[PDB]
Symmetry: C2
Subunit: 416 residues, 2 copies
């Protein structure tokens, strides 16, 4: 049993600060329908041929809250509205905070590997633009241990990293200044990607560094307030991303080949999750994410250098740093290196978040997990346009994270 | 690859009308509490001794409206520290959701995992606290299981309205009596009276009271169209409670040191998922096709007829559902639901005991939990554990049928006693 990425579609990521943000805004249903249908063409399923799927997996976090909506499993089925025929197929919403996307994958994964499916669709989506940021920051706290952590601020989720930050610099583990380097990189990266939430924007590294008013310590908190600049914060984005997956059997039905140019194969997927209550005593580690990483690669049998490209959960500049660390692409404390070495950059030896990552491309939660993969696919298939890689990678991987290293998902992809 | 049910634990189902429910002398149970309970409880029945609790490879939570009632999502890691011995850390965990079938789904995940080999031993836990808000409020939250923007329009009690309409129609099709919906009702209630776990254990009334002609049992629907097509009898319960279950592979057994025919267990040989169009509403309201699909598949995977079994647990979100459930499986033929419900074969002394502990109507309906409860129930009856509703004639063959929404999602399973 082996798994091939076929294709998919990432919608544009919009939200407040995007010129596309408002005519009436896009709906979660719309957004969903789009990401689905869009995935069909790139996979050539579109008109009536759209019924060769055995399973639908939705990855969403806060539908029930922002858009007052759960039960998106069957909502998948009628995103075709005649041509509408997904009816009576396995469908389900899954949820793991910010890693809901990677999870949506793990389901389809296990299914085909069972044989329930040989062809499946995983779609992440996330509309978050229906409420205030105060309100939305509350809804976000559902990813935390609410009753004992919302206590921090109305912007609860920022506060946890400000603290992971605050500590980790004084441990002489890296410069908060390194958190500006990451920032600059992914932003200018976003400037090469028209899908990006923050494509139409950039500013000085110094502006990303500190000394800012347009980039303030917005935290209502009076303790970890300065340990976070708006730079380091991700985006509140709307948008979807769908992906079609197949088995060798699924291929045969589709009439394809295990080495057919059109595809990329997956040979690793690893899930791991920790204690929502018992907070890490080592804030300079993403153990879950460290765990998840190590497993996947070990399942495929490669070293953390044997690859060329990566997409990781930069919910904060901080995260990306730790992400570097949370994988064997970077050694302990030495995150300051590769970020400045610029190996993580597009011309760098190890391009990472070439389209901008969560910071710039944006962070529609459910969607984020799927986006990573599709991104790695396009770079593998020369599709990344003005941030397309010169030197095409045949080996790539992903790292999706929910909460505070609470959940983590990883994957191994090989270009064929 | 083959799947053995090990054991588990169902907590008591409480909620407004249960003497255990607190109205302003003590503080109610929390989703977190409720979760911890169901987890820990599952451990002993499985002997996962104190620190021996770390032989699991995967945690699957089934919840629906945590984010709403209790303002809480991300229950995956919330599992990990329900031990506060606390060492579930850094294991695969995830919340899944499929409205009312979220429980069955939680199962399908663990299922596929062990079958992969990611796990050989997994825990699926359903839980659902729904008692933090008004019923008006709660009925809204419930509408998230519907196609909200185009269906909340019915009433603040949206989900009731859809069945009142499935009802309204189906009687005039001469498919069954609304009076049959009283027969189902009485059964599961008196059934609940033999089960102290039941939400509605401490209650019963006349069949006539379940039939109609009632004021204590009114047409509460704010709606003025399908209002009379539903009696409070036919409505399920708004319950709090959890149910956890430990599952293993032959490998998991060997680690646990067991045997594929060891008395302590029951094996699963079928699981089927299916789901339809949240938007395109059924033109045949006298059918649970999804649920019909799901059913047929599972059994066909195991290779049995719908009579080759002895016992069942099905999604009686309404008396109506159960009826259709009967139909949605080959235990009952089209229109002829009025039969077996009156034949009383579905009853405990009946040839085909169904929802012996009371089902959703009486035992109660904590949504996430419901899917898991079915299985555990089928287990206990198989293991003589059902006490005052324990079966005389023990079954070696059983099955389940979980449903989300309006036949929108359905899950089914095949269990064989060994």
């Amino acid at each position: 049993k082996r798994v091939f990425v076929v294709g998919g579609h990432i919608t544009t990521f919009v939200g407040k600060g995007s010129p596309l943000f408002i005519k009436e805004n896009k709906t979660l249903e719309e957004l969903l329908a789009e990401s689905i249908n869009g995935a069909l063409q790139n996979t050539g399923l579109h008109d009536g041929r759209a019924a060769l799927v055995d399973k639908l997996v939705v990855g969403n976090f806060l539908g029930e809250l922002f858009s007052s909506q759960g039960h998106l499993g069957p909502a998948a089925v009628g995103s075709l509205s005649n041509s509408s025929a997904f009816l009576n197929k396995p469908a389900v919403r899954v949820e793991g905070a910010c890693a809901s996307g990677g999870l949506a994958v793990q389901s389809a994964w296990e299914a085909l590997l069972a044989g329930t499916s040989q062809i499946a669709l995983a779609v992440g989506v996330e509309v978050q633009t229906t409420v205030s940021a105060r309100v939305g920051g509350d809804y976000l706290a559902r990813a935390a241990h609410y009753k004992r952590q919302r206590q921090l601020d109305d912007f609860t989720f920022p506060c946890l990293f400000a603290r992971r930050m605050k500590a980790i610099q004084e441990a002489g583990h890296f410069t908060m200044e390194d958190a500006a380097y990451v920032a600059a990189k992914a932003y200018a990266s976003g400037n090469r990607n028209p899908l990006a939430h923050m494509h139409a924007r950039k500013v000085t590294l110094d502006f990303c560094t500190q000394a800012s008013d347009k980039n303030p310590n917005f935290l209502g908190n009076e303790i970890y307030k300065p340990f976070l600049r708006t730079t380091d914060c991700s985006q509140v984005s709307d948008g979807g991303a769908a992906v079609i997956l197949a088995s060798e059997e699924g291929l045969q039905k589709l009439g394809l080949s295990p080495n057919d140019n059109r595809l990329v194969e997956i040979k690793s997927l690893a899930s791991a999750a920790g204690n929502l209550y018992e907070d890490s005593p080592d804030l300079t580690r993403m153990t879950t994410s460290m765990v998840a990483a190590r497993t996947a690669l070990s399942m495929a049998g490669v070293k953390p250098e044997q690859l060329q490209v990566a997409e990781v959960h930069d919910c904060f500049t901080i995260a990306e740093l730790l992400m570097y660390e949370a994988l064997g692409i970077a050694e302990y404390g030495g995150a300051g290196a590769l970020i400045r070495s610029g190996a993580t950059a597009l011309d760098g030896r190890i391009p990472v978040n070439t389209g901008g990552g969560l910071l710039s491309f944006g962070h529609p939660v459910g969607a984020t997990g799927v986006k990573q993969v599709l991104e790695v696919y396009r770079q593998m298939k020369g599709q990344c346009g003005e941030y397309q890689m010169k030197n095409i990678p045949g080996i790539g991987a992903t790292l999706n994270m929910g909460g505070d290293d609470k959940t983590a998902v990883s994957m191994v992809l090989t270009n064929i």
